[PDB]
Each structure stands twice: as structure tokens, then as C-alpha cells.
Structure prediction request, 405 residues.
Amino acid sequence: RDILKRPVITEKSSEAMAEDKYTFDVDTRVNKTQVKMAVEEIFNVKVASVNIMNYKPKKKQGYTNKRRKAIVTLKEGSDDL
Amino acid sequence: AVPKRRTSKTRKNKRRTHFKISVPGMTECPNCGEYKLSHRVCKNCGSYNG
Amino acid sequence: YRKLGRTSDQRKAMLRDLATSLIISERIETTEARAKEVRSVVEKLITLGKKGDLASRRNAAKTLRNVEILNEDETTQTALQKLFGEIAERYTERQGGYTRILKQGPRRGDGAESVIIELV
Amino acid sequence: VKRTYQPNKRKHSKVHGFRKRMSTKNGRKVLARRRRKGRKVLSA
Amino acid sequence: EAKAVARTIRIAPRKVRLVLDLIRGKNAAEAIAILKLTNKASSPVIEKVLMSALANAEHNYDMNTDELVVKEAYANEGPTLKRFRPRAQGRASAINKRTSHITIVVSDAK
RNA sequence: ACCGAUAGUGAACCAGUACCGUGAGGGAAAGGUGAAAAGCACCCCGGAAGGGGAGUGAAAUAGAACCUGAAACCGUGUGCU
RNA sequence: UGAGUAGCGAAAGACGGGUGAGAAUCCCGUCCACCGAUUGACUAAGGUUUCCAGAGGAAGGCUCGUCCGCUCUGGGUUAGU
Prediction:
């Protein structure tokens, strides 16, 4: 469903970890069980593992928004976006 | 300890009479052509010829 | 007869370090107050190296420092081996006056007048 | 020496927190005064 | 006569005026050597203002450097920066960082 | 027959906000280029900052630390002493 | 005004290369010196991006600064135990 917001494109994500792991930006109210079902339905893949982590607002006078990025490991299939 | 009276301009300018800066000892270098401190080494060329 | 704003224990180590750095490089920069005292300290180490006796080779080891010079590469002759060797064979006929001081003017940030000391 | 203020995250919310000012009529009159004045922070 | 101004320098005016007396009224060739071999913190800054005034004399106008003399040289006070240093027993003492305005005038006396 | 930026509401500015206190509370300073941005293309000194020309405009001793610019205070030159 | 006066917060540094407009203070190397029931190695409270890389020197750093816990841009925290 509409739980994925933005793919992450960085040296840590794109140059490395991109062999089999894909990083995304998810809603701030979803668990790792809802990210596995959403990825398969949209990308037609089979997910093997899913890690998640939280990020706090950063002062920039005002603060940037908080983020939540998850990393999914697929057993079979490739996104190749 | 503390000053009883403030200092006036007339008195302040007389004390600073000898508070001057010195003019260095400089001469024209035989080979460089620029000015040089006596008994030193020409910065421009590097020759002393003692 | 100078103290150089240091204690007796530091005024001896700094002199041992300045004498060894010169024998290796043959030309160094320092202040004027340090150059006029290191002058007499280095001129006596060459006097010992011109006698050649083993007794003199052991008295020079009390002031010299253990430092290798790879430039020569012939076993990386120690600082003490350079003396009694390359340096002892140059001033054979010269009796005194193995150094020369040169002025350069004050240095920025400190006001101290830099000097150049080298072996003649 | 030891100074008067030693920070403590939990003790600061239990004594001056929002939920403790609402448990008392006098505490509620504190938030009504800060609201009437236009403060950006009400409690804590 | 050509002029050059260096505005809002971070050196105290009293310290800049000490070197301005050594060059006021001298020649444009002997004033550069004096400023160089001197060992004051205001020499490099004052020298860069005199080099831009001699360049203005031959580019905007056309005057040969051989006929250039230091006519006027003075320094004025600029805005100050108010800073505070902590003292003993909870006291504070104000500190001033003063600025200067350097002006140089070269002329050929003709 | 009220005030005109130390005045008038604490606040003509994004003010119950900078800041101060464990807390209940206490609390400021800050308006003005020009009729029109037409906000100095380009050359020169400099690492920059800054400055001297050129140009815009009625005016740049109107160049954003920008209407008018008093006194204290700090400098340079000079007639008499 | 006092006044270019007091002070600049416990302590060992020296030289040779490199960078650059500018080096006693930044980088690399070799000697020397200090702690070692410890100035070493892990972790609660508290702080809340001070962490990493490239690029900067107006202000802050009681001097300097090419450097920084300072400025700009982009990054960094993965648990069935």
C-alpha cells in the first residue's frame, strides 16, 4: 500500500548493500511486518528479512522532519529500479 | 591606589612624548639592489659576502 | 654561561639534541641565543673525533645521541660513526673555527631573530 | 563542590509535568494563567 | 595626487599610528623598504594600501613612480566590537576590539 | 484644540519571542535608499575584504552598518605664542 | 580617564621535510620528556548531533592559525536471544 515514500540513494545504499538489499522510506506508524507485505505486492518479489530504524528531527531557526528507513533482503527476485 | 583626579588631554599628550617607534638600520645591498639590515642576509638575493 | 630560560636538566638535553641535528643535516635554523652556546658544544665534539683513540670515542658517546642516517645507506652509519669518519677527515689541518653563524632577521609571531648555523 | 541543581529527566516530569498540574484545582489555575498570557510552553 | 583607503581593519588605531609617522613625507621608494623590514603587526597591512595607491597613479591617471611622494597618511577610528571577559566571584569586565581606517595620498608636487 | 519611535499597549519588527529561574514567575532591544532596482556590465591593485576609474540617476557626501546627521571623544595641516 | 598599564588559568620540548598569499602554533618523520590502582580500556545518570568526509577563515578560540567541539554542503545509529 501507500507506505513507501522514497527510495534512498547514497554510497552506503547504492554503491554498497545494493547487491541484494534495498533501502526505502516508510511511514512513521508502520511496523516491519507491514513493510514486507507491501514490498511484495508492489514489486512482485519475495522478501527474506527486514530491518528498521528511527531517526530524530535535526535543527536546521527550525528542525527537519523525523525519518524512518527500512532495509529489505529479498530471497528471490530483484528490484533493479 | 585609585586616581584621585582624571587626566586631562594636555597632561596625557606630554607623557606620550617619548612613546615613539624606532627607524631600523637599513642600507642598499651591493648586489641585490633592495634595502637591507646591516649585518643581516639580503632576503631578495641571499648573499652576504662577509 | 647562558640559561636560555630553562632548568639545568632541560638545558642539557636541548643542547645534546641541537648538536646531533647539526652533524646530520650540517645546516639548521634556530635563535641567536641558542646558536652562540651550541657553537662551543659542537666544536669540542670534532676535537675528540680528530684524536681517534678509543677513550675519546667513549667520551663523545656521553653527549651524542643514537640516530641513524639512511642517506649514506652503508649500514646506516650512526651519528657517532659519521663523526670520526666523514667529519674527522675534513678539518684535519684546521685548528678551531668549524662553524659559522649567519643572521636572517626577526621572525613573525614571536619577534625572535632567526639565525643559520653551519659547519665550515 | 556539589551545586544546587542536578538534572533528572524523570523527577522533572513527575513534579512539574502536564499530568500533575491537571490533578489539582490549584494546578489547573496555573495553566489558565499561562494560556491567558500567551506563553508557548504550558508545563515542564 | 592619488588616494587609497582601507576600511574596517581589525588593528587598534593607536597601534597603527605608530608606523604611520615613519613614512609620512618620505619617498614612494624608501617607504616600501621601511614597511618591509619593520617587525610590527601593522606593517603588512599598511604596505598593501600604499601599493594600491601607486597603482592608481599610473592606471587611472598617468604619473611615473619616479616622481611620487607620500603626501598625507593618517588613520581614523571605525566601529567597535563589545566583548565580555568573566572575572572572579561572578563579575564581568567589558573588552573592546577597535577598528581603523587607513588613508594614503601620493603626489608628485607639481 | 489625543501619541508620533526614550512617545503611544510590554510588543509599528512574526513579542509574551531573545534571555533569566527547579518551579510558580520576571522580560527586553530592533521603524525611514530612490519617483522608478533603474542594486555600480567592464578595466586596474589585492588571496580575500576594501578601494580608485567607468556607468545608472535629478542628486551615490542617496551604494542597503543606505533621509536629515547635533555634542562628548579621536586625528591631520596651519597664523600667533 | 586610569593605559599601551594588570593579566593571558598548575606541566618539555628540539630539528628536518610538506602545504601556502602569510607558519614558534597546521600535516608527516626521527629523537627527547610525562602518566601508568593510571592522564589507559569499558559502562549508568546527564547533554542532545558536539560523530564521518570534502570545502571554507568574517566572527568565536584569552597570541597565531592554512587548523578546530566554529561556518557551508552531503552523509551516519539494522536485534525472537
In short: Residues 10, 12, 14-15, 44, 81, 83, 85, 95 of chain E lie near RNA strand G (CB under 10 Å from a C1'). Chain E has one domain: 1-110.
